[PDB]
Design a protein around this ligand. Sequence first.
Ligand SMILES: *[C@@H]1O[C@H](CO)[C@@H](O)[C@H](O)[C@H]1NC(C)=O
Ligand SMILES: *[C@@H]1O[C@H](CO)[C@@H](O)[C@H](O)[C@H]1NC(C)=O
Ligand SMILES: *[C@@H]1O[C@H](CO)[C@@H](O)[C@H](O)[C@H]1NC(C)=O
Ligand SMILES: *[C@@H]1O[C@H](CO)[C@@H](O)[C@H](O)[C@H]1NC(C)=O
Ligand SMILES: *[C@@H]1O[C@H](CO)[C@@H](O)[C@H](O)[C@H]1NC(C)=O
Ligand SMILES: *[C@@H]1O[C@H](CO)[C@@H](O)[C@H](O)[C@H]1NC(C)=O
Ligand SMILES: [Zn+2]
Lengths: 187, 597
Amino acid sequence: NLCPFGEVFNATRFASVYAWNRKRISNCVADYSVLYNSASFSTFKCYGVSPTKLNDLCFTNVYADSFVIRGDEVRQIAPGQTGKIADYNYKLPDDFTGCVIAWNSNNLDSKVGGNYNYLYRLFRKSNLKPFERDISTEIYQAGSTPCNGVEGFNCYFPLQSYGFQPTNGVGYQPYRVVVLSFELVCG
Amino acid sequence: STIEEQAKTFLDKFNHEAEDLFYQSSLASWNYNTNITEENVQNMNNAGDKWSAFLKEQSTFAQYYPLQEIQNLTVKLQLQALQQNGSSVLSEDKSKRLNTILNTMSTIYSTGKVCNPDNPQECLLLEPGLNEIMANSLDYNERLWAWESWRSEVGKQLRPLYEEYVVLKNEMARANHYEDYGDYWRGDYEVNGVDGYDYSRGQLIEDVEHTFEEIKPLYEHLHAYVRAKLMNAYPSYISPIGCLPAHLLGDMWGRFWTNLYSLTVPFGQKPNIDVTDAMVDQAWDAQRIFKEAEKFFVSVGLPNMTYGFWENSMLTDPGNVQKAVCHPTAWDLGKGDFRILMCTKVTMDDFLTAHAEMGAIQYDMAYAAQPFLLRNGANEGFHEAVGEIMSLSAATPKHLKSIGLLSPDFQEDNETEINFLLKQALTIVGTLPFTYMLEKWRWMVFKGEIPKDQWMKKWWEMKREIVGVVEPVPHDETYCDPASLFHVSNDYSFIRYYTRTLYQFQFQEALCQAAKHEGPLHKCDISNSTEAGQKLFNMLRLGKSEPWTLALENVVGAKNMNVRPLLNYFEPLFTWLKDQNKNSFVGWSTDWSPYAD
Ligand SMILES: *[C@@H]1O[C@H](CO)[C@@H](O)[C@H](O)[C@H]1NC(C)=O
Ligand SMILES: *[C@@H]1O[C@H](CO)[C@@H](O)[C@H](O)[C@H]1NC(C)=O
Ligand SMILES: *[C@@H]1O[C@H](CO)[C@@H](O)[C@H](O)[C@H]1NC(C)=O
Ligand SMILES: *[C@@H]1O[C@H](CO)[C@@H](O)[C@H](O)[C@H]1NC(C)=O
Ligand SMILES: *[C@@H]1O[C@H](CO)[C@@H](O)[C@H](O)[C@H]1NC(C)=O
Ligand SMILES: *[C@@H]1O[C@H](CO)[C@@H](O)[C@H](O)[C@H]1NC(C)=O
Ligand SMILES: [Zn+2]
């Protein structure tokens, strides 16, 4: 049966990067051809398997990780790119078998006056391990003083919101990202 | 946690939160300009109030981090800019006073109305209209009225308001720990903590004074040659030894002599280098002008103006429906947004102005990959010099051939170069005495050397001596002629308009050497020279991370301001001007007067 790829990509809303939604895709036939031939995607880097090869390739389980990030940071959804997002929000295994899909969401996720809904972790005591979702909203203690769970000196809220005005530059416009992984579901 | 590592994570929080705040306030500031409206002005104030209020809290927290025990040079500079007390020291409504009087000054110009006596309906503003009188009219009586009525009606009005401007802004003295308001603006050039490069604020005075003396030879002869052409077109009014009257200069104030190119044309039978008469015959709208400007730099190497530029910029006058500031402004908003606001006209001046503002945009673009505070060029003159370095190339007669304005013939005569150089001298050489004079009197006011009972009058003695320009009508101190100019009313530096001038020739010399130009500097187009463009972008990106005195050395051999490139660019003109002015008197009398008769 038709894999529910339609609702992942055509979703009315996408989750923030610090809480990336994962939808399990299993026991369905998937036409990957519509994805690599849609022409509506800016980035489509399949790191492990060629899209041509996986069209008839059966698979054990499929999950879809979908989040919204900055276009300057789309570089970071990649094995070994470092940077703030991969460091403290969403990191790939560096042995990752799968694909990264990205397209501009300035038409949908940017509004006059700016949208401040999307959040990103700015501070984390230790770098995130691959496929680890952290949503600990505890003040990152930067100095010697203890924060006691309130804002103060060297006591910053580890979460900061994206600002998305439509007149922004491309490197600052919101991009909608869907990450696909494969484990070891045909076509 | 070392103190610097604590300083970086604090600065890391700043750069994220501030960029959106600066963008939001700057977005409303654009809208205030585009659609002048009581609602839009308020939006700028409230949002701008948040940007200032946000700055004060982070400033207090930045002082908690010591400026010592930090070693990464960028960390020190970033902390200083935040650690500055700023305009917060004035107590509450006292700062609101400074807000109101300054907010009034943006309105007084925009609402400044001189009215024709013959028709009481017919009142004019400092729209293009009044400036068009100073630019084209050849009637001594007509120019004088616009010269006089503007500062008679509107100047005087600003005299008590500019009186408190210094009184209230020099209150900052020894509060912000700078001695006088002239010391603050000079702090832009200050670099400290760098061995062999530490530039103190007092060095800027002495440097400007010395280079200006070497400027005087060329200017006096220009002043003499202009007087001879003016005396023919204006018999009786002008004396062969006296200072030039201010109204017969190009602008309402005489900032640029480029308007007088028609009257002061050396030869005039050869093809015109002022191609506004060709642009009207080449039907070039504002879009064409900027599109040709965009094409100039993409030839150099910088890619295209971001579509957000073309989509959101205003390069044309709105018309009657929308009232907007028309002054050329290379806006930069951050967050990847770059725009230009400039009511544009079918004039070579607007053709050359556009090329400079776009060069400033591409400056603002090149150092985008920098921490928030370091993205403003390494000093004030840099930002204003990068655009004119290209503008000098834009007006070059060879480059004007490729653009399609000068016909395919290209008479490379010994005369056309002098025609071209004199138009360039009028625009470039003439503004430097006026600049030093204005800022010298500005600095001396902040120090307190001129009391209000000697104000205004001194301004005119200085203008007679330094610039060689006289006043048509005597002015009491109730008059306020200095604050007839936008830069004085909006509390903006004006010496930044002269450091760029010595700079703009310093760099072009090296850029021509990079392009391996065979010949003089006035024959130099940076076009199609990828190497010279890479040299600029390599040092456009540095921003304020590297001290200016250091970034200067890397591009051009000198580590400091040097007038020598300017003289070499004008050396053919200087020698010719000497030969022509052998009979006429070079120099002026500080005692002559057009009213003493
Ligand atoms: C003029 O300002 C008003 C603000 O009430 C706005 O409705 C209108 O869109 C503005 N015109 C523009 C943006 O061209
Ligand atoms: C003014 O500057 C001093 C510098 O020592 C600083 O301690 C003080 O907090 C500043 N005032 C403010 C931030 O209101
Ligand atoms: C120190 O080096 C550079 C100096 O340009 C600075 O931009 C950077 O933030 C610092 N690196 C770190 C994190 O140590
Ligand atoms: C740059 O912009 C011009 C503007 O018309 C366009 O023609 C050109 O193809 C662009 N060049 C690029 C994107 O390399
Ligand atoms: C730069 O090169 C272009 C194409 O090669 C040419 O059309 C233009 O005239 C050149 N500009 C010069 C020689 O100033
Ligand atoms: C043009 O050249 C002539 C002849 O070489 C010489 O008199 C002078 O350099 C120029 N004449 C002018 C500027 O009137
Ligand atoms: Zn200007």
